[PDB]
């Protein structure tokens, strides 16, 4: 929705009620996002870096036009700000469509890249751990991919699959359930039938996951953003 920028946090909303975009605003820069006839600009460093996730739709990719600026003043990149939201997690991607001209600053060359620049919700504590997951995996112009990822905590292992993308299909393999510095439940693994991946677990009971995978193809590395729930 547009409300995600221009409405307070009513508790009685769908799922994850807010997320923070400090990870998509450039250092001492701006991020401006707009859609549905509303706009809001997001100054770096501020506390006012929260996006009302509560207003969007659950289990679907929501989309915002965006533009990255810094400091007179120059524009860094533009494209589509993409957010997938579940009840305790959300993944965010930047589909950069134009960038700053490496020669002519104050000029934007056309250039498509895709980078995952967010990961948030209610992480599960690696000590509070108590399932199978199936969800969405998306890269640029590719939002119908699917992810199924199952592990049991007692083995503490890691193995899942990515299919249904229009580009290749990747294997999420042989990964240990570890604990990052924030004491949070966080998987990390390699990936072949081509690079690495990283999951993160969220939710009261670890009901959901959300993270990102990379695939090395020739010289270009395709970032994919994955997320899924249990049932």
């Amino acid at each position: 929705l547009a409300d995600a920028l221009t409405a307070p946090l009513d508790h009685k909303d769908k799922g994850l009620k807010s997320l923070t975009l400090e990870d998509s605003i450039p250092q001492n820069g701006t991020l401006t996002l707009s859609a549905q006839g509303a706009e809001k600009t997001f100054k770096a460093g501020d506390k006012d870096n929260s996006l009302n996730t509560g207003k969007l739709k659950n289990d679907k990719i929501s989309r915002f036009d965006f533009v990255q600026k810094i400091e007179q003043t120059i524009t860094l990149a533009s494209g589509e700000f993409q957010i997938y939201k579940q009840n305790h997690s959300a993944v965010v991607a930047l589909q950069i469509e134009k960038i700053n001209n490496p020669d002519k600053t104050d000029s934007l060359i056309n250039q498509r890249s895709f980078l995952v620049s967010g990961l948030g919700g209610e992480h599960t504590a690696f000590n509070q751990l108590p399932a199978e997951y199936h969800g969405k995996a998306f890269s640029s112009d590719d939002p119908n991919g699917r992810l199924h990822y199952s592990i049991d905590f007692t083995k503490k292992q890691g193995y899942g699959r990515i299919e249904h993308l229009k580009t290749l299909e990747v294997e999420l393999a042989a990964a240990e359930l570890k604990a990052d510095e924030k004491s949070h439940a966080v998987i990390l693994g390699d990936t072949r039938y081509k690079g690495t991946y990283h999951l993160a677990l969220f939710g009261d009971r670890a009901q959901e996951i959300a993270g990102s995978a990379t695939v090395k193809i020739g010289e270009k590395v395709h970032e994919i953003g994955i997320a899924g729930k249990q049932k």
Partner: antibody, heavy 119, light 109 residues
Framework: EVQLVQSGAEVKKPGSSVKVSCKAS????????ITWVRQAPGQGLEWVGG????????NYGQKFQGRVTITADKSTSTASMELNSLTSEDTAIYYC????????????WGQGTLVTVSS | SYVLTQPPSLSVAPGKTATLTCGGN??????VHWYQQRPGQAPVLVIS???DRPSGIPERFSGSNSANTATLTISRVEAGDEADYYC???????????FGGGTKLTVLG
């Protein structure tokens, strides 16, 4: 439940111009990517150009760049397309189409405006 | 891609599946939208982002996109599916919206 509604049929001498206006009923066109698509007799859908609110400007199809202006005026609460130096090849139905994102599919459409250019 | 190739006409028996084609040099790399249009009426978006189905659209309608072909697929065709079907994409390489030529769907029987 939003409904775009358009400026009403037009007749033009060649080399004149036309301004076609679009407004929304259960909503607004303002700060929305408005887009203009035309359809000429016996053909189909063709892009003219469209407003992108973030870059505060409009993009236009290479066929009309130079003789078209796609603008909006928040006082009148209406979007407008203005196509100058008309030819009989400009005879067409003109639809305004709203979408939530500059690359988002047009989910709402006006009812068309028949513009007939002839001498 | 930039050029979208729609056959100008497709014929289908009632209740069978209609398979509408939209061709593109690696159209997989783009996310296409589909509109249906009836005689004397503004277009109505029937599919978006490849294989997304909006509010009022019957589940007989569904879309996919792979290699060099997007496909709008209508199962169990009704007579009121007779319509022109346009496929659209946004071409970043030109900053253009691009519509296919359109396919006139003819329902037999």
């Amino acid at each position: 439940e939003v409904q775009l509604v358009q400026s009403g049929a037009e007749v033009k001498k060649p080399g004149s111009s036309v301004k076609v206006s679009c407004k929304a009923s259960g909503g607004t066109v303002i700060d929305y990517p408005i887009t203009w698509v035309r359809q000429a007799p016996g053909q189909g859908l063709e892009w003219v150009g469209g407003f992108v609110p973030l870059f505060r400007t409009s993009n236009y199809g290479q066929k009309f760049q130079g003789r078209v202006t796609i603008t909006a005026d928040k006082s009148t609460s209406t979007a407008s397309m203005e196509l100058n130096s008309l030819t009989s090849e400009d005879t067409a139905i003109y639809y305004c189409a709203r979408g939530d994102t500059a690359m988002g599919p047009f989910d709402y459409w006006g009812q068309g405006t028949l513009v007939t250019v002839s001498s | 891609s930039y050029v979208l190739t729609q056959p100008p006409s497709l014929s289908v028996a009632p209740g069978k599946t209609a398979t509408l084609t939209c061709g593109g040099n690696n159209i997989a790399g783009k996310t296409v939208h589909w509109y249906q249009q009836r005689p004397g009426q503004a277009p109505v978006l029937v599919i978006s982002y490849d294989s997304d189905r909006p509010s009022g659209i019957p589940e007989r309608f569904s879309g996919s996109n792979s290699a060099n072909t997007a496909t709008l697929t209508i199962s169990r065709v009704e007579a009121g599916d007779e319509a022109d079907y346009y496929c659209q994409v946004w071409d970043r390489n030109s900053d253009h919206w691009v519509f296919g030529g359109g396919t006139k769907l003819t329902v037999l029987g």
